[PDB]
Write an enzyme that holds these catalytic residues in place. Structure first.
Site, mmCIF file in Angstrom:
data_model
loop_
_atom_site.group_PDB
_atom_site.id
_atom_site.type_symbol
_atom_site.label_atom_id
_atom_site.label_comp_id
_atom_site.label_asym_id
_atom_site.label_seq_id
_atom_site.Cartn_x
_atom_site.Cartn_y
_atom_site.Cartn_z
ATOM 1 N N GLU A 233 26.125 87.092 -8.151
ATOM 2 C CA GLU A 233 27.048 87.897 -8.985
ATOM 3 C C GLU A 233 27.988 88.740 -8.154
ATOM 4 O OE1 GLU A 233 24.798 89.807 -12.128
ATOM 5 O OE2 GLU A 233 24.452 87.808 -13.046
ATOM 6 N N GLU A 338 20.786 81.208 -12.927
ATOM 7 C CA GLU A 338 19.975 82.364 -13.398
ATOM 8 C C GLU A 338 20.119 82.658 -14.873
ATOM 9 O OE1 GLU A 338 20.109 86.242 -11.066
ATOM 10 O OE2 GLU A 338 19.850 86.945 -13.135
ATOM 11 N N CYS A 340 17.723 84.957 -18.066
ATOM 12 C CA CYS A 340 16.559 85.582 -18.696
ATOM 13 C C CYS A 340 17.001 86.230 -20.002
ATOM 14 C CB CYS A 340 15.860 86.600 -17.771
ATOM 15 S SG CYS A 340 16.838 88.052 -17.350
ATOM 16 N N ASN A 368 24.496 73.395 -21.842
ATOM 17 C CA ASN A 368 24.820 73.171 -20.438
ATOM 18 C C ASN A 368 24.896 71.675 -20.083
ATOM 19 O OD1 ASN A 368 23.787 76.000 -18.441
ATOM 20 N ND2 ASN A 368 24.651 76.032 -20.496
HETATM 21 C C1 LIG Z 1 25.525 90.682 -16.964
HETATM 22 C C2 LIG Z 1 23.980 90.747 -16.900
HETATM 23 C C3 LIG Z 1 23.419 90.248 -15.538
HETATM 24 C C4 LIG Z 1 21.883 90.278 -15.572
HETATM 25 N N1 LIG Z 1 21.301 90.423 -14.223
HETATM 26 C C5 LIG Z 1 21.834 89.514 -13.177
HETATM 27 C C6 LIG Z 1 21.309 89.817 -11.777
HETATM 28 O O1 LIG Z 1 21.550 88.690 -10.932
HETATM 29 C C7 LIG Z 1 19.790 90.071 -11.750
HETATM 30 O O2 LIG Z 1 19.503 90.714 -10.504
HETATM 31 C C8 LIG Z 1 19.333 90.937 -12.939
HETATM 32 O O3 LIG Z 1 17.884 91.114 -12.930
HETATM 33 C C9 LIG Z 1 19.836 90.369 -14.270
HETATM 34 C C10 LIG Z 1 19.272 91.155 -15.498
HETATM 35 O O4 LIG Z 1 19.758 92.529 -15.526
#
Ligand SMILES: CCCCN1C[C@H](O)[C@@H](O)[C@H](O)[C@H]1CO
Ligand SMILES: *[C@@H]1O[C@H](CO)[C@@H](O[C@@H]2O[C@H](CO)[C@@H](O[C@@H]3O[C@H](CO)[C@@H](O)[C@H](O)[C@@H]3O)[C@H](O)[C@H]2NC(C)=O)[C@H](O[C@@H]2O[C@@H](C)[C@@H](O)[C@@H](O)[C@@H]2O)[C@H]1NC(C)=O
Length: 495
Positions: A233, A338, A340, A368
């Site tokens: 990210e 990723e 969740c 996807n």
């Molecule tokens: C826009 C939401 C992003 C969610 N996060 C992405 C990040 O890569 C992870 O480290 C986080 O645990 C995850 C959930 O907050």
């Protein structure tokens, strides 16, 4: 080995979890022209096997899904999850016999046959300690780079155990959250800040060399990587006050970092076969990010693929993002790296037995796949009942929840929804055409195994039962029904 049913338990949500412990976990044990059906339901069925005949003819006006085996799309890389510090700690909190059943649930053919493991490069939010691998300030030659115990005693031995259990080759994917703080404009692991200076300079060459040092160190422990992403990210490091480990890149900064530093540094190393994935971020950033990076021939020559996260999918219709990117750059694979549930501020982190969260996984995977994505990777492999540990308390949900005080783990609907794909869609499978005879509320995707046999997954997110037929022009017709709130995987030999 031996089929063992789900031991169901309700925590007051829409469906049940399956309870496992030191001595019990649910597990698993087709002639042409018969098919196999695996069904999971909100009512409590968990990947149950049944079989049916394939008929020579069909008559009726009901829904028909017709396989188009000549219409060939992407090949599948695979499915899996992330071995974070939090996941490793949760798994290792179980007694060793329960640890083995958890690992087998995921990585064995007696479980769901995961073949991907995402590995953070040092600490993220799902860590209890904040560290990088080169915290000694101004160590530009990285003489003091080393793996700490989070890797050597925790993650690495667990990854080795997963590989031993797996019959399929397992592909590791590495992603960093932050660089050492002394490489960063803001001097902190979090907050708004990028690498100091500009691509091509000492800071950027040092950060590129850190990737090679990471790979060197893991290879010393007999682990080889399939791929790395360029940054987890990168957009996060552009945001004022971003609460945990990040490292900001605009798409131009990423382009030039890949062209000048990361791409050439990997290419000149013993790790030159490790793939480089760009983006590793929300799909709404496509196709813009793909255009910026991939239309520079110097960056493009190093990028194998584009990694996406699912968190803002609501802002990003798949056609306008994934579909457009594929259309423009069909040779650069799209990969879901990723996901969740439970991560929004208003959401309960863990909802034990949530069917909705299950359907969210399978709906995303199908969508996807229908838009050219080659694999899909869950986040933490296991969490505690609070959805942690997490040093910033950014708790979320996980297909497996570990209850240390009971030496127990719970497999949630998310586990089985992912299993409906991972268990039955080997690496090298190819998505093929599937057309519907009428508008319907089902999510469905058809693929062909390397050996030429067929797999169809069908998700019904509605409360209504939908009878339906699947037509394979080679073999004939499968007469079936998709119950409300069910997911089925269908398998058959075509020869
Ligand atoms: C826009 C939401 C992003 C969610 N996060 C992405 C990040 O890569 C992870 O480290 C986080 O645990 C995850 C959930 O907050
Ligand atoms: C680990 O998880 C397994 C599966 O839940 C436990 O084994 C099971 O324990 C149940 C006891 O709660 C057994 O059931 C009972 O059957 C009788 C009739 O024969 C009923 O009257 C009664 O109401 C129960 O339903 C169940 O049969 C058993 N095994 C399997 C394969 O399902 C296990 O519990 C432990 O082992 C069993 C065999 C007993 O010795 C239990 O006392 C013991 O707790 C779980 N392990 C632990 C330590 O919790």
């Amino acid at each position: 080995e031996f089929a063992r049913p789900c031991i169901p338990k309700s925590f007051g949500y829409s469906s049940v979890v399956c309870v496992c412990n030191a001595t019990y976990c649910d597990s698993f044990d087709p002639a042409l022209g018969t098919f196999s059906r695996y069904e999971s339901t909100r009512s409590g069925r968990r990947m149950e096997l049944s079989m049916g005949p394939i008929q020579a003819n069909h008559t009726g006006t009901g829904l028909l899904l017709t396989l188009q085996p000549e219409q060939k799309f992407q090949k599948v890389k695979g499915f899996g999850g992330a071995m974070t510090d939090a996941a490793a700690l949760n798994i290792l909190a179980l007694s060793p016999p329960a640890q083995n059943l958890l690992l087998k649930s995921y990585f064995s053919e007696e479980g769901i046959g995961y073949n991907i493991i995402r590995v953070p490069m040092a600490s993220c939010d799902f860590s209890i300690r904040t560290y990088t691998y080169a915290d000694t300030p101004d160590d530009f030659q990285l003489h003091n780079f080393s793996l700490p115990e989070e890797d050597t005693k925790l993650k690495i031995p667990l990854i080795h155990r997963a590989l031993q259990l797996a019959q399929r080759p397992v592909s590791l994917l590495a992603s960093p959250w932050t660089s050492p703080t002394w490489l960063k404009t803001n001097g902190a692991v979090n907050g708004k800040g990028s690498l100091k200076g500009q691509p091509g300079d000492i800071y950027h060459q040092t950060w590129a060399r850190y990737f090679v040092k990471f790979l060197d160190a893991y290879a010393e422990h007999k682990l080889q990587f399939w791929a790395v992403t360029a940054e987890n990210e990168p957009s996060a490091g552009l945001l004022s006050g971003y609460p945990f480990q990040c490292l900001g890149f605009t798409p131009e900064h990423q382009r030039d970092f890949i062209a000048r530093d990361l791409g050439p540094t990997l290419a000149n190393s013993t790790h030159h076969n490790v793939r480089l994935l760009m983006l590793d971020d929300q799909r709404l950033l496509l196709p813009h990010w793909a255009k910026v990076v991939l239309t520079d021939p110097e960056a493009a020559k190093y990028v194998h693929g584009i990694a996406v996260h699912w968190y803002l999918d609501f802002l990003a219709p798949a056609k306008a993002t994934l579909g457009e990117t594929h259309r423009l750059f069909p040779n650069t694979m799209l990969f879901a790296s990723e996901a969740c549930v439970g991560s929004k501020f208003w959401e309960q982190s863990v909802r034990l037995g949530s069917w909705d969260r299950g359907m969210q996984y399978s709906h995303s995977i199908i969508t996807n796949l229908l838009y050219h994505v080659v694999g899909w990777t869950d986040w933490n492999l296991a969490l505690n009942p609070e959805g942690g540990p997490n040093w910033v308390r950014n708790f979320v949900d996980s297909p497996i929840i570990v209850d240390i005080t009971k030496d127990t783990f719970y497999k949630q609907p998310m586990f089985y929804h992912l299993g409906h794909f991972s268990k039955f869609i080997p690496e090298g499978s190819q998505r093929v055409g599937l057309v519907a005879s009428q508008k319907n509320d089902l999510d469905a995707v058809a693929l062909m195994h390397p050996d030429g046999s067929a797999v169809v997954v069908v998700l019904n997110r509605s409360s209504k039962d939908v009878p339906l037929t699947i037509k394979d022009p080679a073999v004939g017709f499968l007469e079936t029904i998709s119950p409300g709130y069910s997911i089925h995987t269908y398998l058959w030999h075509r020869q």
